[PDB]
Amino acid sequence: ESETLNPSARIMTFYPTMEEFRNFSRYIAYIESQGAHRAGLAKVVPPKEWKPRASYDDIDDLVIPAPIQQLVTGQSGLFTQYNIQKKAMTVREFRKIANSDKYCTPRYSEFEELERKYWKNLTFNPPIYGADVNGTLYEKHVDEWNIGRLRTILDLVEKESGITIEGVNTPYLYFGMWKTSFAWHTEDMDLYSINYLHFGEPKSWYSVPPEHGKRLERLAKGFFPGSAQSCEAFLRHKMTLISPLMLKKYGIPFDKVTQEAGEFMITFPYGYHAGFNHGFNCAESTNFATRRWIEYGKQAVLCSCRKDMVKISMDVFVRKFQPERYKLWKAGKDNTVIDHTLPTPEAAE
Ligand code: NI
Ligand code: NI
Ligand SMILES: [Zn+2]
């Protein structure tokens, strides 16, 4: 039974063989059959022989068009991040800043010590994040887990209508330095996401189980009463940071994991996640779907204040995969209830 698998909803890690690795959608279905989605976040370590790019010594002149200076404001584990756009710069220029004494990773022993330093110094010395860069570092002939062309049913958006949504069905690169953050969020349309750390220092993550996401939302509306009034889904603005000590103090179930260079992280529908970079690094990310995502897409609560513009029409999905509920859904009478513990149907294998 689904409730019986990964009942603690803890972050799982997988080490596929190259044979299991070759079929992306299939391996996602496998890890769900093991309960991985209940944590909201999973690690996949690819076969040691697999490489998405030959070397990264040839990207120093790649342009980061809109680097972001991250000014964080707050106290007692609760923060709001404000973005200041900086002028474009090259990877070379960015690495130099990231590694300069002003911005570099501080000295530490255990990850636990670095984590404490992050939460203590988050609002000081605002760092610059090279975020939302359109592009890919995958070499063109890599066919396994190519973030540029995963061949999931999310492809139906572009295939049927021609619509591309940057970072959603196209890839984004993220150039990190110490103390750059990604605030608490689920993906647009509560999609899955895939995140690969090409090189550099680690990226640390926090995740809340999808079956407990409503609890986190309840806590956040309470602590940011202003934001909650102005938008039905203000966490999608990706400005809200909440420390793990605050999650513990209010009983929000969560887990933490550190991603190292060469590892993938998968986020699952309605899995809230946040985190930070340890130092200079580069990650590549995009969204994807499975059949189980469709019901989350139908039910996603979207930003109401126009700050987050991403909306995908679900009609194509409901028509193709849920023909028996289409008419009901169009009349607003599809009362379907999501069971977050269930794996996607492709996993029945
Ligand atoms: Ni639980
Ligand atoms: Ni995300
Ligand atoms: Zn909004």
UniProtKB/Swiss-Prot annotation:
Ubiquitinated by RNF8 and RNF168 following DNA damage, leading to its degradation. Degradation promotes accessibility of H4K20me2 mark for DNA repair protein TP53BP1, which is then recruited. Also ubiquitinated by the SCF(FBXO22) complex; leading to proteasomal degradation. Fe cation binds at residues 185, 187, 273. One of its GO terms (molecular function) is histone demethylase activity. Residues 139-305 form the JmjC domain. The keyword Acetylation applies. GO terms for cellular component: chromatin; cytosol; fibrillar center; nucleoplasm; nucleus; pericentric heterochromatin. One of its GO terms (biological process) is negative regulation of DNA-templated transcription. 2-oxoglutarate binds at residues 129, 195, 203, 238. Residues 11-53 form the JmjN domain. Zn(2+) binds at residues 231, 237, 303, 305. It is found in: Nucleus. Ubiquitous. Keywords: Acetylation, Chromatin regulator, Dioxygenase, Host-virus interaction, Iron, Isopeptide bond, Metal-binding, Nucleus, Oxidoreductase, Phosphoprotein, Repeat, Transcription, Transcription regulation, Ubl conjugation, Zinc, Zinc-finger. Histone demethylase that specifically demethylates 'Lys-9' and 'Lys-36' residues of histone H3, thereby playing a central role in histone code. Does not demethylate histone H3 'Lys-4', H3 'Lys-27' nor H4 'Lys-20'. Demethylates trimethylated H3 'Lys-9' and H3 'Lys-36' residue, while it has no activity on mono- and dimethylated residues. Demethylation of Lys residue generates formaldehyde and succinate. Participates in transcriptional repression of ASCL2 and E2F-responsive promoters via the recruitment of histone deacetylases and NCOR1, respectively. Belongs to the JHDM3 histone demethylase family. The 2 Tudor domains recognize and bind methylated histone H3 'Lys-4' residue (H3K4me). Double Tudor domain has an interdigitated structure and the unusual fold is required for its ability to bind methylated histone tails. Trimethylated H3 'Lys-4' (H3K4me3) is bound in a cage of 3 aromatic residues, 2 of which are from the Tudor domain 2, while the binding specificity is determined by side-chain interactions involving residues from the Tudor domain 1. The Tudor domains are also able to bind trimethylated histone H3 'Lys-9' (H3K9me3), di- and trimethylated H4 'Lys-20' (H4K20me2 and H4K20me3). Interacts with histone deacetylase proteins HDAC1, HDAC2 and HDAC3. Interacts with RB and NCOR1. Interacts with VRK1. Interacts with FBXO22; this interaction promotes KDM4A ubiquitination. This is Lysine-specific demethylase 4A. It comes from Homo sapiens (Human).
